[PDB]
Design a protein around this ligand. Sequence first.
Ligand SMILES: Nc1nc(=O)n([C@@H]2O[C@H](COP(=O)(O)O)[C@@H](O)[C@H]2O)cc1O
Ligand SMILES: Nc1nc(=O)n([C@@H]2O[C@H](COP(=O)(O)O)[C@@H](O)[C@H]2O)cc1O
Lengths: 256, 256
Amino acid sequence: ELSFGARAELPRIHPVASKLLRLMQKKETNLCLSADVSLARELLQLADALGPSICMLKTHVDILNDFTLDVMKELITLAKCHEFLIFEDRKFADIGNTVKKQYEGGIFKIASWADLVNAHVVPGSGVVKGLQEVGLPLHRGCLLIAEMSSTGSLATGDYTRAAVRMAEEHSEFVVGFISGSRVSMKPEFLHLTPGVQLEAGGDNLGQQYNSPQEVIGKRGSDIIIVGRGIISAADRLEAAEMYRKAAWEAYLSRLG
Amino acid sequence: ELSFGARAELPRIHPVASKLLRLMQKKETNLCLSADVSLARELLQLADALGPSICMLKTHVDILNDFTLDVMKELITLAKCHEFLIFEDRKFADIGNTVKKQYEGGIFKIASWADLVNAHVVPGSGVVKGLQEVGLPLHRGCLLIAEMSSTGSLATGDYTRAAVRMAEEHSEFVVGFISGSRVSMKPEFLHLTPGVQLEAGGDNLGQQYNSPQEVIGKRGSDIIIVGRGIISAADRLEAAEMYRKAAWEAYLSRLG
Ligand SMILES: Nc1nc(=O)n([C@@H]2O[C@H](COP(=O)(O)O)[C@@H](O)[C@H]2O)cc1O
Ligand SMILES: Nc1nc(=O)n([C@@H]2O[C@H](COP(=O)(O)O)[C@@H](O)[C@H]2O)cc1O
């Protein structure tokens, strides 16, 4: 196993993955904050406060009651200052011709500010081909959803293998996976894992949790994505630090 | 086989499906216009001119460069005047807790104006449970994506079977399917089929086409969803009528 810093230098590494891996090593963080909030001011307050603790800020911009592109311009300022990537968790899942427009255009212009986006592989590889027509000129990366954390997820078995093959065949744009475990043995690919909290449990709508030690240490993922585990805490700074320390120490131990 | 008018009276029929089936019968249309345009003015001019020819207008609100809720108010007015349903093709595909906010909230407030939305089944049934928390008191309906039209679609076999099961188990909210063919024998469920053109072909990003006669006549679907086959024509009204007649006659042929 190679350190994040060494993986940042791999010959076939995507530039977006390399940037992320370098800041992960620099800041000792493999925590992605899931900034699931309804107001621009809350998104920016949390990004600023927790910026030092995170390698990545994951957005759902379609849940912002007061989105404007100015909010995203300000988010990019915070990203540059604190050194984290912005990942819009849009889960593109349409035919290639459609996702191209949903990525570049409309009100959100996602490709104009998101370093990373993700996509479901269910439509076939056209979903990647469409996104990459916009993504490649704008120097962006994409994560493919190989597994889901939720109860009854169909992203298993042959479906997961399909996601890996699609990633391999689109490595100029696809930088890795959303998954519950390592799904590829190629160290150029990133693994990001949501459904993470320190304590066992779930929510009332299908979410299931595993701990940072299980996910990073035993399951070989790179980055934990944490929402309510941090946001619902009384002290979000302390919470972000506990998750960062948990995921980082789990990564160090796996590294030996 | 039961006519649309008779199916609108089935004991277990959803009120939204009933309203749709009744207007399909009254207007002799089983055509859904896929209004894939980026300008509100073009969207509304299409909805007005083609309204008498369609049973449903499918939107991608996230592609509209000048979306406002006022545009959707104008669309609802035309939908009421001409008698068609509005279907936002948002393809919800996240965990239940997230899709609930994506449906109710953000800038789009999709649930406030869309009669129908659709969801991928890949996250497990939590995706439906989340949407239904919002959609049920608003008397909305949901279509589950059982099959896709695009090259390399993973929505096949056990995946398709899972979609049908999930629909059956959530029949208070799920009114049917996006699919390429009839997937359920229950006549209470609607089957809507995209990837439709009069001519053979596809696009350069994985779309594949079949004819209205094939899809409605031989594959037993209810409604054709048609985008570029209409939108790209010089005269979109003439094109919609061609598709309406094709799909309607194919349906009458299947009745006997
Ligand atoms: N497989 C997945 N599981 C997940 O839990 N997510 C996403 O990651 C976030 C969850 O953190 P938490 O569920 O609030 O404790 C949320 O924004 C959701 O949309 C996304 C996935 O692809
Ligand atoms: N499986 C599916 N295939 C599809 O092509 N669609 C949607 O149906 C529309 C296809 O329109 P077009 O006739 O290929 O221009 C488009 O809005 C696309 O997003 C939706 C699906 O669920």
